[PDB]
Amino acid sequence: SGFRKMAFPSGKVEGCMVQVTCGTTTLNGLWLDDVVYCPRHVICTSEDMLNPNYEDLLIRKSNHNFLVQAGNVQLRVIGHSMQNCVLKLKVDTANPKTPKYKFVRIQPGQTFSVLACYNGSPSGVYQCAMRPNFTIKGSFLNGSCGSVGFNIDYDCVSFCYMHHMELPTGVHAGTDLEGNFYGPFVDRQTAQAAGTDTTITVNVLAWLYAAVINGDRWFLNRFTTTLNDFNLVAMKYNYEPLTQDHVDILGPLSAQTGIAVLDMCASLKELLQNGMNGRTILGSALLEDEFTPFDVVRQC
Amino acid sequence: SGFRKMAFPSGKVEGCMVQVTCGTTTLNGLWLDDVVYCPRHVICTSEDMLNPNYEDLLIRKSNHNFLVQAGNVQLRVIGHSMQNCVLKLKVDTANPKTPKYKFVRIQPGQTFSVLACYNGSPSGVYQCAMRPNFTIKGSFLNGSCGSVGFNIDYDCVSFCYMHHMELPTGVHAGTDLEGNFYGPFVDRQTAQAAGTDTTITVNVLAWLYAAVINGDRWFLNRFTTTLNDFNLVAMKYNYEPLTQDHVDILGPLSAQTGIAVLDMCASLKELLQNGMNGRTILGSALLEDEFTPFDVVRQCSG
Ligand SMILES: *C(=N)N1Cc2cc(F)ccc2OCCCN(C(=O)COc2ccc(Cl)cc2Cl)[C@@H](Cc2ccccc2)C(=O)N1C
Ligand SMILES: *C(=N)N1Cc2cc(F)ccc2OCCCN(C(=O)COc2ccc(Cl)cc2Cl)[C@@H](Cc2ccccc2)C(=O)N1C
Ligand SMILES: [Cl-]
Ligand SMILES: [Cl-]
């Protein structure tokens, strides 16, 4: 029993983290097979950063301008290219610790583990949700760029995020492993801000199921609701609308507990309309939205 | 920037987890050098757990009754002994992935990372505090006994917890890696309950500093207070008392922020009397007490 914001075991990713230095920048790289992936802004000087021409800059670099250090070993760079905002450094040695892996692009609302690293050295692990506004609320210090987010499928690591950017507001943005940003952000130090964030409604529901599974049920009620009535209320609190896809995804929790999705939606509808009254759920005074339906199943 | 409940990277522990079976029980063992540590209650049937005589039961087991599997390779057990409430199984092979480690006993209020496992397979990692009642609020499923808690000090893994028990309350109890329980719990299936918990005051203040470092500062107040003053209020609210030792360990945070510890205690006293008024701190509507001062320094410095 019990319920925790739990990350995936990070050992398979720790074995892939290396230190990448170009010019005056040191940050993290992800060594898989014979390639090291890292943010392409590593090739910029802090003056270049407002309007860098990355193609022109990369052409002007040589392999020997990149220092890749695997703990205590120095990896010879023998090629380099760009895919969108990700720099790919070909090295002369395959990483023997390379796990089975996939590159995946996730959707807002989905969660993943972040291995925060500093100058190639793993520092800590935590669970993140991709917010509806395409940011994450992470924890990073200098040298953390190139840290990655991942999920694990039994044996296979799905890499879904690489850390690039901290906005002046303190929110974090980054790319998938194809170098495409999540959200409308660009890797230039121009004025940028994230859209209005919203609550991940399907995750709140999932967590309410986790609460029932743990015996917490003061918030249940005799009412059921329609998806349109629920969504009219949700929009008034900046909650994402619920779709029938969300309802299906909740299906397993609905069966495991005997509480229909739209019966549980009425519980959330009531909590939003009337509030919590200084009661808590799974130890929280606020509604939690960083557990997907799958996270709750996995843990419960 | 940012602030998260972050665990230590778990890879050094993942390489030590193995599966242990005895009789009708499968759970986890910790494979270090040529010994596998696991809960002694692995030798018990459900009926034994009503009143187990561990010494009699262990006598009657042979090395071949212990099936230890490291991934898909089986390890030969060559001796077994009991150390308090943990079994030590001697195997014929040293673990090649043994990290630099030590065994340590922590104090309530201290935090550690938990690598939750299922029958030898790492499943997830999260950060816990040892509560003042010597329980931990964990997340475990069947086959999770023998999962361990740990901290990492640069290269060195400090093992501090092994999971044994889930209380009717849904909270968790276990031992250090020497086999001694944290708290007044026993590995017998008898009525047990977690005593009164309390809030870890020095940790709450650590988190208020984290919040200041991250821009949240509405709760900073004009006022200021003394230790005895604050400790009076604290106890009325089931907050642990604040010692001059706690003031010292907050010293780095106070020095980095320019807010004296007793100044911040004034803010905490106000929050306790007046609540947050629908405001939040670091996105919490409640006061968080599972970050130690070291945790904040580590994550908000390096
Ligand atoms: C990654 N290693 N880092 C360093 C770092 C770490 C940290 F915890 C906080 C900030 C920080 O970098 C400081 C500035 C560089 N930076 C940014 O993302 C800053 O971005 C912006 C700042 C100001 C304004 Cl007006 C707009 C923006 Cl977008 C990145 C590199 C980068 C810069 C600009 C765009 C994209 C990436 C960075 O080095 N980091 C986060
Ligand atoms: C560890 N592998 N497990 C299994 C397990 C996992 C889980 F997520 C939830 C329960 C559970 O164990 C079921 C019962 C065995 N158990 C207990 O801790 C139960 O403890 C108690 C039950 C009833 C009463 Cl009145 C008091 C207690 Cl404390 C342990 C083994 C154990 C039994 C009894 C005392 C201490 C340890 C167990 O196998 N586990 C948690
Ligand atoms: Cl809260
Ligand atoms: Cl024997």
Side-chain angles (χ1 to χ4, degrees):
Chain A
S1 306
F3 199 70
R4 280 278 183 193
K5 193 157 283 170
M6 76 170 43
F8 287 102
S10 61
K12 281 179 185 178
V13 178
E14 290 164 58
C16 304
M17 294 318 294
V18 302
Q19 175 187 279
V20 175
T21 297
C22 183
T24 196
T25 298
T26 292
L27 43 68
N28 304 283
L30 176 69
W31 183 21
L32 302 157
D33 290 313
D34 58 337
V35 179
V36 179
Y37 307 79
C38 69
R40 69 176 177 174
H41 66 64
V42 80
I43 72 191
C44 300
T45 75
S46 183
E47 166 203 346
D48 284 322
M49 266 317 289
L50 183 57
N51 292 290
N53 187 315
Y54 283 103
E55 200 98 79
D56 206 66
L57 283 164
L58 188 55
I59 283 159
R60 298 172 192 273
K61 291 296 186 312
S62 322
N63 292 341
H64 49 90
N65 297 139
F66 300 102
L67 177 62
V68 183
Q69 224 168 278
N72 206 12
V73 173
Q74 187 174 349
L75 304 184
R76 180 166 47 101
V77 179
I78 61 177
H80 57 276
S81 61
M82 202 159 46
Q83 180 171 23
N84 299 301
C85 300
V86 165
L87 175 63
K88 301 193 207 202
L89 297 183
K90 191 183 201 73
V91 287
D92 70 359
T93 310
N95 180 1
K97 299 193 218 163
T98 302
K100 301 178 170 189
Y101 66 101
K102 305 174 165 199
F103 289 174
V104 173
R105 187 175 177 89
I106 59 159
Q107 317 255 290
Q110 290 184 334
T111 59
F112 53 90
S113 308
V114 170
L115 183 61
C117 298
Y118 292 90
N119 308 311
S121 287
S123 205
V125 50
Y126 49 88
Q127 192 74 352
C128 265
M130 176 66 61
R131 306 301 315 168
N133 71 353
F134 290 99
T135 66
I136 75 183
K137 306 154 162 176
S139 184
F140 297 116
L141 299 157
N142 204 3
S144 62
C145 286
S147 291
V148 298
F150 61 101
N151 291 293
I152 312 193
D153 178 13
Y154 168 60
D155 50 0
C156 165
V157 186
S158 292
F159 292 103
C160 60
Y161 179 88
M162 170 170 280
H163 182 52
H164 283 247
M165 224 179 68
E166 186 161 310
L167 297 167
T169 29
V171 87
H172 305 113
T175 64
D176 60 31
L177 268 299
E178 303 174 50
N180 287 311
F181 263 90
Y182 289 102
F185 310 106
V186 298
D187 53 356
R188 348 193 319 244
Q189 199 150 330
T190 191
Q192 292 184 74
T196 273
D197 203 18
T198 56
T199 303
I200 305 157
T201 307
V202 63
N203 290 0
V204 173
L205 289 167
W207 173 79
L208 295 183
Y209 281 107
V212 173
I213 286 160
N214 277 251
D216 240 354
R217 64 202 319 182
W218 63 265
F219 49 81
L220 299 176
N221 62 26
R222 70 190 196 261
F223 296 105
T224 188
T225 189
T226 90
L227 259 183
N228 281 325
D229 290 354
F230 173 80
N231 281 335
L232 293 176
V233 176
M235 299 237 279
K236 286 176 231 213
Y237 295 84
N238 266 348
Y239 275 52
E240 281 289 313
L242 214 68
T243 82
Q244 180 83 29
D245 295 316
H246 295 149
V247 171
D248 300 333
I249 288 148
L250 287 167
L253 294 180
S254 172
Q256 160 165 15
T257 60
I259 299 163
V261 173
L262 274 178
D263 184 358
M264 188 71 80
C265 286
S267 277
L268 180 54
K269 173 176 163 182
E270 188 178 30
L271 287 165
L272 296 182
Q273 286 186 317
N274 308 341
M276 309 233 318
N277 282 80
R279 282 179 194 172
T280 60
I281 300 180
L282 289 170
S284 303
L286 292 171
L287 305 183
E288 252 297 327
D289 73 348
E290 298 223 340
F291 298 91
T292 70
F294 317 87
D295 299 337
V296 171
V297 174
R298 153 159 102 102
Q299 205 175 140
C300 306
Chain B
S1 86
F3 199 66
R4 276 275 180 194
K5 197 153 203 221
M6 84 165 54
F8 284 107
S10 60
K12 290 181 170 186
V13 184
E14 289 169 52
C16 308
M17 302 310 301
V18 297
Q19 175 196 108
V20 178
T21 299
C22 185
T24 71
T25 303
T26 301
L27 46 66
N28 306 285
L30 185 70
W31 183 22
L32 299 169
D33 297 295
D34 60 347
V35 174
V36 178
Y37 301 84
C38 72
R40 66 178 181 173
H41 67 63
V42 78
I43 69 189
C44 294
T45 70
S46 212
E47 183 206 58
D48 292 324
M49 289 302 289
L50 288 331
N51 197 25
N53 181 300
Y54 282 105
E55 205 49 283
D56 179 55
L57 290 165
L58 194 55
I59 287 167
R60 309 194 61 75
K61 308 286 183 181
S62 335
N63 300 328
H64 58 252
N65 287 92
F66 297 104
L67 311 196
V68 181
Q69 249 175 267
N72 192 241
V73 161
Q74 205 182 0
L75 313 182
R76 171 178 163 74
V77 171
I78 66 173
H80 59 272
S81 68
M82 178 166 69
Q83 187 181 2
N84 296 311
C85 292
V86 297
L87 273 184
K88 312 204 299 175
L89 304 173
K90 196 68 172 288
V91 294
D92 71 357
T93 302
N95 186 352
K97 301 177 204 171
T98 302
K100 183 175 179 185
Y101 74 94
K102 52 173 119 83
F103 293 167
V104 309
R105 194 175 170 86
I106 59 169
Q107 298 285 321
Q110 297 210 254
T111 57
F112 53 99
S113 308
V114 170
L115 176 60
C117 299
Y118 172 74
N119 297 351
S121 299
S123 192
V125 58
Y126 53 86
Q127 190 76 355
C128 285
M130 181 63 64
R131 304 301 316 165
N133 63 13
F134 293 104
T135 66
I136 76 174
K137 296 166 183 166
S139 180
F140 295 112
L141 291 176
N142 198 16
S144 64
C145 290
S147 295
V148 297
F150 64 96
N151 289 302
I152 299 181
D153 190 359
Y154 177 52
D155 51 338
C156 187
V157 179
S158 297
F159 296 104
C160 58
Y161 177 87
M162 183 170 268
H163 181 48
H164 287 253
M165 203 174 81
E166 178 167 305
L167 289 173
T169 343
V171 297
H172 301 108
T175 70
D176 58 33
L177 270 289
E178 302 178 10
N180 288 310
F181 262 88
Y182 290 98
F185 306 103
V186 302
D187 54 356
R188 324 197 152 245
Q189 195 148 298
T190 201
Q192 310 183 55
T196 314
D197 206 7
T198 55
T199 306
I200 309 160
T201 311
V202 64
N203 284 6
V204 172
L205 295 157
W207 170 82
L208 292 174
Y209 279 106
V212 169
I213 298 155
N214 274 262
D216 289 20
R217 51 174 296 275
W218 54 265
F219 53 82
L220 287 172
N221 70 18
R222 320 181 172 267
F223 325 110
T224 180
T225 200
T226 102
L227 252 194
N228 298 3
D229 166 294
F230 172 83
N231 270 330
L232 269 178
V233 181
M235 177 187 306
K236 185 269 169 77
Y237 289 89
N238 273 272
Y239 272 61
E240 207 70 39
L242 205 68
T243 72
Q244 202 74 24
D245 299 20
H246 295 139
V247 188
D248 289 328
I249 63 176
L250 291 164
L253 297 174
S254 153
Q256 183 68 26
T257 58
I259 304 173
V261 175
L262 288 195
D263 185 357
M264 188 73 81
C265 284
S267 296
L268 176 55
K269 180 183 140 191
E270 180 179 346
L271 286 163
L272 293 168
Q273 306 165 339
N274 302 2
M276 299 200 166
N277 301 279
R279 294 201 219 76
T280 52
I281 305 173
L282 293 172
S284 281
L286 291 177
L287 304 177
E288 254 292 330
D289 79 339
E290 300 218 330
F291 293 92
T292 63
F294 177 71
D295 295 328
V296 174
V297 162
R298 184 175 101 76
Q299 170 172 182
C300 307
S301 311

